[PDB]
């Protein structure tokens, strides 16, 4: 037979990238928001031009809806035996009933487990769609505060156009250097800014300071990293084992039932307005730059032996362009060496005539060319 | 219609997967063609056999 | 099997308008317990033929109660015991008690929700009794055809009655009736002419029989047993060698015609989707007002 | 939207559809419509 | 369970105290649109306002019991006429039956057939009556005896059909079959001879899911004498011109006169042969219409037992759409 | 980052139905929201695996499109259809119900892409194809240039201020190329047009109010194409994640190409011999 | 209701093969509650046209369980429209979600669970989507019309198909239909200024071959061209006919496919849920 | 309509105007807007 | 159905349909020499069998 | 699907002709040998315990 390798979500390294809270009334809530308020610092200039007041601003970000599901079909002959209706009094029908109920248990076991790998996948699907590429991001954080006049924006796009086509593949075009890899990884880990502070995380190493982020990859990249350029820091970590909670009761209740809204920290606002378990899990850490991050490859623990594609194999898209029959001007046709690709003696030289085809390489390297008579599909149509 | 043999078929467009010449070009020493099911030589007016 | 639709929050005011359409029908794509409003949407200026062809590859479903969060639908195809349900009549004329409804695109001048906050449009198909719909389609097509040959553009008899009141059949230029129906009239008139031509080509001497004693006798003999007046279909002339630029094999043309006619006949509805069984109410429901229905 | 705890009772019954002028908003559903039993709120979770 | 329909109406044609429950009722179209559609529907040569008059001679009333309609046709056994006449309470009833007969005979003459004027409801079970105003209630789906009548002598009911009109098919056609579950079809029979025409009603049961050829052979005499006397009063022209013969020899002619598109107004293209398809007075489809049927439901058994009647057995109401029978 | 996402899990609920059997269908509503001002995640795309699509050639056949008024003489265009569809795949064979390209047999490599052709005067400079270029010639796009840049010609080209355009047959409003590869001219077909995103300003409704919006938009734009054996057009609703920096720049890259097989030999050497030319590769794929 | 099909004694060489036929459809003749296997059985393959004509005269039934004594069934449509059941596909083309399915007799034969012990053989009909079943019926009936992977016709029933077809076509000719027949050149000229207009017309159109070869004069005004109008009547008649032309030659679509969880397209030889119509 | 008790403090400062494309609706003001002080409610004064 | 038909192009160089008209069609010249079911086998080993 | 098996065989054809011999073609890249052996050892999967 075969067992079922169970997996929980809080034990993964990925859990430190999100704060999970059960909210059993979510099926009731209309659009919910969160309110920020930030206050930019200012510095004092001098001389003629007048000073400026310190600026404030507010902002809100709204939620969005997602869901999971998993079918559970059970059969005909077996639903007859489970409920005792079709059951007969024998020493053989009882055994078949035992078999059917073991089937049902072994089925609900797999179905209920799926809601862990579900979130493990959902987190990657969410994080992957909100993250800009590193290339398009490093210089943008280098021209901050300056993108007012057109000339700065122009220089910015002229540097993006190079970054995107020079640094879009490391550790495949650079397998001889070691420090370039490390510098790129440090850049990646430092280009981002820390988010709000919450004390329910407490994700800590076995000894000291807390962790900072994750590094999810494929098994191949993790293997090429963990043997030449990166050194393991430890092999265990203390993580939380309990979820968060958010319930409406005894002050949010009246408000949500008569007005139509219910703040979360309502009790604290009230009592201010009127007077009034760390587990031990085996993960793999690493230190990069001056931060401590998880270093995971979830292709085996989850996503293995199923029918979904690992969401970290991206898709790059380039559009090529090549000119077909252009004829260079007069002063630009010239042989670099008098001994050219000299044709057979006695026949005219077909290297002087206007060209009418281009040759390029296929995916592997077999040559495949394009000539005019492939344009009949375009230049032979009433649309012309 | 135009007879296929007289008008040369093509250089590349012979090997396209559509024309009806590959169907009869499969030996370097022989030729194949459709012909009236009569005996040769026959009467003057080509029958519609 | 009740599906819900996520609703990207729009605005006040518009959500009231969305609440007003608590009875119409919407065409889902697949039976999943979740769907986004962006999915069930069609450009409300569209080709009538293609929309009527697409109505087959979908599932009908009626919009039950709506809330700022989501809206609930109930499919009509699959179902258990054919439970009752409410329906907002939206055709041009009322429908009585005890008949069958059919779903046709907005053949005449169109109405479409324009949810300017979410930047998408909706089409809600008309709800017509069976025979009246099968005749209204012919009405609009025949008017377009009479216009086509540039003859007398009006005859004052493009009107349809329903329970006394006379309906006017709005003028055929309002939204795009000169453009969103061209496809239908073309695809119908052409097939009709082709069928006639094929028949006459198979039986060349049909229209040279007795004006009252030959044609009727031929039809009655054909409907009856195997006499058939010999090969009533005379042997057509032998075709060309299929590379001559003027080859015409009549039988392959008949084959294509059979196929196209069957396909066009199936993509026209006229197979009832529901039946009004109103009870405890005014026996005749006017347009715009809900009406109890049981799915067929 | 409808009330929870009535404050005081009204003393004399009267036909209401006749005295529509005295009021600003008016709504007379036949019996037990759907909008009554919808408890759908909306609320901000965090402030920072 | 089964679901019902209630329709308040006038005690004109179906009179729910006169008959006991368990007999099919029909819904009658508003006559205004019939009278209107006539104006464009009656064929050439015939009268084009005679249905107007026939209706005006019978003066909402919406339902009509089949027990009443079968009497106002050709086929009927006079026992049922006597029953309808002497057993209906209502005033002036025989006169109304006569006028209704004239109405239906006008309907077929004007080529607006009654099958396009009578949708079928289920079998009635209950009613409350004021003075000349009733509210009948009939089933619409499910089996009849899922209902509950307020008789208190026989809570449930059955389905009763006048045995004079019930025409069996299988035992008629001699299929050699064995009676199992059989369908049930209400069929109409038209006959068209100007000023000498009538309508025949029947209720047909069989295992045949598709009537078609079955009626085409069953009603052979009707179709025969209807296809030939149907085009009457239509002026046909003289002998058809030889130009009417659609030329076929010219399709695969390599050498023939030809004309590309885009030069068809009045160019030097007069060399094309003329062909005038000329069809004026021949038998159209509405001319050869002889019968129409509609599926009613499924049936176990039919027993005959008393005025003669025919009690159904486990009738399951499943109403279908109408059907033409012309070919 | 240490806390990048708030994440609320609802309450599970079971929906039961009948289907030979009894289909229990779980579900669980859940929601999320970013809670960091500024970016909280970033990726690098380190390695490279095999190109999922082939990089060969496939002449697009316009005879699958409608909207072009056909020629008067029916013999003329019947001859056209008979002489272009011959031996050309993705020819619209009249298979029932669709008149669509037939299902090929056997696949060399990944789904074969589609190619387009744009008329262009012969005196066009060649140095315009060495670096990254725009098939139009007017390099307008969006990132560099306000509105009124895409089609105006009284304002010099941004990328080459010397001249106004580099291909008058493909830049003017209502020009030749425009009438074929534009959004609002109803001449699209079932085949994917690789240049559809270069002659379309329809995003004028979607004006940009920040470069960060464009940065975040790329690397997450839904896939326009399909996954069949060719590059067919796909309904926008389904979609799939794919990254493209071309939609940000409206620019293309020249591959390793040359005008004769004799110049693509392992001793590369000279890049311009005679009338024939060679173009080094300058793409994100130097290796 | 559950049709019960009884079985004779069977050799283990074919009982185990019959077990594999759990989602195919058979054709009874009468709907009694009980029926022996010998009754529901069709002869070996022959005259696909005759067989397709026979499916109209009998109502189908799909089987669900196969016990060593008893084999159940379910009468497909007699009073129900939502009895969601499962039946396996056996046609070449894979049927996708959304569309209806129609029963068609098998081609080439070779699909016969020939039972030797019982001395009989069954031919379960294949299941095709509507769009392709229509085309197959078109091809076969046209081939039958030609005779005045493919079996030849029999000249005894092909005439019946020809008769049905020619009747349904004859009754299209109306004094209004000639009015439409008059604008063939006015249609061709319209199929030139635009693209879609030309697109709707086929290639071997069998009408473009006519509009460019024969001129027809203005139509004769019919009797009483003031009271009534004929084009409308002819078009209504044509709609009424074409809505029911496909079934009269083949078979009505019997069930539409609905699947709640599985992958949309189901391949040949694999069971897939369904609801009947 | 600002908040009274922030649930949590933001850790990092960042130029917020350039990243304005991340939020749904927002508004800056120079200093000390006047609207945010006078807050007026709406109260129903009895049910019957 | 890919090995012998010649309506579907070469699944390796899809420009053309076949690169040798004398060794691809059924019953071609080169085929009648080294096919398995055609019985021209000798004692020597045949690489292209 | 077809598009996946396509790339798969197109990669197999390339792997067979580049890595069909180690320890005799790459004796310098002493790391490459260890990498190949670790790939070999981890490429299979455990059996019943």
Author numbering:
A (entry chain g): 51 to 326, 337 to 444
B (entry chain w): 494 to 542
C (entry chain o): 1 to 296
D (entry chain p), H (entry chain m): 3 to 50
E (entry chain h): 24 to 82, 94 to 340, 348 to 368
F (entry chain g): 1036 to 1054, 1056 to 1323
G (entry chain s): 1 to 148, 168 to 296
I (entry chain w): 1184 to 1232
The authors write:
The MCP (VP5) is encoded by UL19 and forms pentamer (penton) and hexamer (hexon) in the capsid. The hexon MCP is decorated with the SCP (VP26 protein, encoded by UL35), whereas the penton MCP lacks decoration. The triplexes, each composed of one VP19C protein (Tri1, encoded by UL38) and two VP23 proteins (Tri2, encoded by UL18), anchor to the capsid floor via Tri1 N-anchor.
The A-capsid is empty, whereas the C-capsid is fully packed with genomic DNA, and the B-capsid contains a core of scaffold proteins but without genomic DNA. Here, we use cryo-EM to image both the PRV empty capsid resulted from abortive DNA packing (A-capsid) and mature capsids fully packed with DNA (C-capsid). From the same dataset, we selected a total of 14,252 and 8899 particles for PRV C-capsid and A-capsid, respectively, and, by imposing icosahedral symmetry, obtained three-dimensional (3D) reconstructions at resolutions of 4.43 and 4.53 Å, respectively. Local reconstructions were then carried out to finally obtain the cryo-EM structures of the C-capsid 5-, 3-, and 2-fold sub-regions at 3.31, 3.46, and 3.43 Å, respectively, and the A-capsid 5-, 3-, and 2-fold sub-regions at 3.64, 3.50, and 3.41 Å, respectively. The structures of the PRV A-capsid and C-capsid are nearly identical except for the presence of CATCs in the latter. Because the Tf triplex is located at the icosahedral 3-fold axis, the densities were smeared during 3D reconstruction with imposed icosahedral symmetry. The models of the asymmetric units derived from icosahedral reconstructions of the A- and C-capsids are nearly identical, with a root mean square deviation of 0.298 Å over 26,091 atoms, with the Cα positions of the two models aligned. In contrast, our structural information confirmed that CATC binding or not does not affect Ta orientation at the penton vertex, as the orientations of Ta from A-capsid (CATC absent) or C-capsid (CATC present) are the same. However, the same strategy was unable to procure a 3D reconstruction of the portal vertex of the PRV A-capsid, possibly indicating the instability or altered structural dynamics of the portal vertex in the A-capsid.
